[PDB]
Amino acid sequence: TEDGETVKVFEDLQGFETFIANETEDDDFDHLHCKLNYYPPFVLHESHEDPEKISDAANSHSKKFVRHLHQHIEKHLLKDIKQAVRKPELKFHEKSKEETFDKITWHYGEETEYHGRPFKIDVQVVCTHEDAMVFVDYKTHPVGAN
Numbered sequence: 001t002e003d004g005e006t007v008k009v010f011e012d013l014q015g016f017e018t019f020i021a022n023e024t025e026d027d028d029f030d031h032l033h034c035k036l037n038y039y040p041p042f043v044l045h046e047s048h049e050d051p052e053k054i055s056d057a058a059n060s061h062s063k064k065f066v067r068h069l070h071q072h073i074e075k076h077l078l079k080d081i082k083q084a085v086r087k088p089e090l091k092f093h094e095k096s097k098e099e100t101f102d103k104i105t106w107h108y109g110e111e112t113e114y115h116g117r118p119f120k121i122d123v124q125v126v127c128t129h130e131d132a133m134v135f136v137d138y139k140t141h142p143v144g145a146n
Helices: 013-025 039-047 065-083
Strands: 008-010 033-038 094-099 104-112 117-128 134-142
Touching: 008 013, 008 065, 013 033, 013 065, 013 134, 039 065, 065 117, 065 134
Parallel strands: 008 033
Antiparallel strands: 033 134, 094 104, 104 117, 117 134
């Protein structure tokens, strides 16, 4: 896995989820930032399990691509994040979707607390018109610190 700036960029859910879980055990949960860039399972399954065989139509301009991506986000990705932060019943009370010609961005946000420390979880998920890759950004920070 790459460190793009001071942030780890993972290529699979296992590495990403394990990072978040370990950093939670290590009391670092309120100052985390990592990324995950991958192709969603459905698009690989549609393309002979080869990124080079993915249709050029499989991108943010395909209603089917977007719908199936959202389904994966809601069934798997968020479930993994909730498991890792030890809050399986968490709900994100901030949700948004922004669509431009070039990309669709979903945001899921929640102010929560763990070990007596309040913190904000922000999950950004981006898909684009250029190709089928999905870009996840996971970031936390304290709330109301002085």
